Amino acid sequence: GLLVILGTRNGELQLFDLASSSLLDTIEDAHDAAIWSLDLTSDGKRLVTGSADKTVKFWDFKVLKLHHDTTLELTDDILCVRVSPDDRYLAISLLDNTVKVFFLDSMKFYLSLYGHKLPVLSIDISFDSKMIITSSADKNIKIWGLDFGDCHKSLFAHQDSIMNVKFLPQSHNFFSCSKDAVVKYWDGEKFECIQKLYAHQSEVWALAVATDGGFVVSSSHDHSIRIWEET
Amino acid sequence: KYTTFQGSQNFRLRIVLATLSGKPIKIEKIRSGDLNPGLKDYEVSFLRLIESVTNGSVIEISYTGTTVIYRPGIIVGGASTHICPSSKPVGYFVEPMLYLAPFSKKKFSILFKGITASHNDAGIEAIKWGLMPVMEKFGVRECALHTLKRGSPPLGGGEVHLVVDSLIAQPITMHEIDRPIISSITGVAYSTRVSPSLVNRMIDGAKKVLKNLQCEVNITADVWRGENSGKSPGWGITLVAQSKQKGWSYFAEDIGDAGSIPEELGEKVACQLLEEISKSAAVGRNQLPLAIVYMVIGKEDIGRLRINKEQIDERFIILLRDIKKIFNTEVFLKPVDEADNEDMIATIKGIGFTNTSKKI
Amino acid sequence: NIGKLIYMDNISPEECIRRWRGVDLEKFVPYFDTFEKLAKKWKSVDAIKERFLTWYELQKAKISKQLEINNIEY
RNA sequence: GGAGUAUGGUCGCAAGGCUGAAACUUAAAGGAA
User: Fold this and answer.
1) CB within 10 Å: which end of chain B, N or C, has fewer?
2) Using CB atoms and an 8 Å cut-off, which of residues 289-348 of chain B contact chain C?
3) Could you tell me which residues the WD repeats occupy (chain A)?
């Protein structure tokens, strides 16, 4: 249906539909403070939202309107929440140097992570739920193995602070985007800098990956959207 | 080649009981109904272990691999290093040698290298607290089991060091006709290459179950790090109830799974502890074949042991039918007089057993 | 009796317990039930709460007491 | 009885590798240089 879902610094969750005019439905007062994350499941009947209200709320795609099943009462300033594409694992970043990975079905607190010294700015996990990447403002990437809750390798890169990281759905090869205006391409097995991009020169705020093709979309502070087609 | 056993069942038990008796055995038709019939790799690897500790033993394998001939030699021992194959953990190999430990010509200083835990076989803490205290009740005083490096599946790389220095002439004649009263619940919760917050969260599963019990609950958090923490990550807990009066210990264990909840596993083993205790009398179900043997190979005298019918399964009878085919010792079973429970006293005239090998 | 039901070889050990009520030893941990069945069983610990809380003639008595404990047994 | 020295015994004490160090070579910062 080409439906679009967005989040604000106001505690609200407004959607945009392309065949119609702009607004069909708006959630208002979903949270009190700013929300910071929004993840989509494989189906789409439930979304997960993470906010500065120390709350994580699920949102039920009723047919088309939204309601909540449960809320999650936490203690920290939630930044990114991501669900597994295998629909099993739900990772949550906090204000602390902690990543909590929850089971999807009953929220059993499967896992916790330590040792990062600065809060996690984006969480990824693989297509098959094997590797976790939790990039944070502490100038490094810590690649966590998802089987036993350990890391395989930490990785200092991207001088300023690392905003967004996303994966390739084919294999363990990922990108990295950061405030120091560099985009880098990595191995999930060799752990080496493959290809290093410098093109758009301000702070890289956003990143997205084509789900089959492999073109790379990045955003700047200075208003540039760069598309990197794979040869 | 005179006593013949059928099937690969209790294979490491049958090599032990032939070795102490000195009666030659021939175990034929091992896994004959398989697409890969015959022995496995580790069963061959275990036969290399008996050769290394006993000089004079003759071991013959037929070229179909299903028939194993073993004329036992005397227990020499000494110090050596056995490599454990990655199929079975090192606890599959520590457990038979404790039957051979107090009788060797020299000290057992045997170094084991490999994976140190699994689902089936005994962990290191299962032996250091569950089996070695059974040993001391029969008079094996200076017995130990040290941990150098701890491993975990699938790569392992862990090392234990079996050191047994008490070399006694026979196990003493045990009389335990009283169900021991549990004084404290001890335990070890270990973890390798993973987050140290698991171990306290493991214990929180265990202390959640036991809060209705009034005895001491203490679990030593054993967090491993560094090079002596083995290759592959993993964790596990081992819980031990004990009796202050005579030193009897009851235990249960399990390890972590590929994706397991550490709150559940700390809750699970404490349930498996109390389930084991509820079926128990003076031993555990996994400590009972170590003690059944030590009444048999104890000296020419009646021992007594208060055991429970819940322990008596199909597995327990196959233990008593391996002894009668070797040592020809009927195990008399009498009811107890306590009408609240179905305990029975297992009375065994021990076969008159010595040390062939120890020097004077 | 359980013992004369044990020492026969025509009986299977499956049948031995079925005669008594009316598995390989290679694995070390004996067969339990599932944690689903055990956690519901072990909500209460009240079933198991029953179990909690001259030198010469001395050493010659280690033999003499060992003698008549054979004799009352036989 | 005291003083002193020696001491392969029993018991206790302790060491080194910059810290930060999570299992990973890992930031901000500090220490030494």
Assistant:
1) C
2) 289, 301-302, 304, 309, 312-315, 317-321, 324, 330-333, 344, 347
3) 30-60, 115-145, 157-187, 199-229
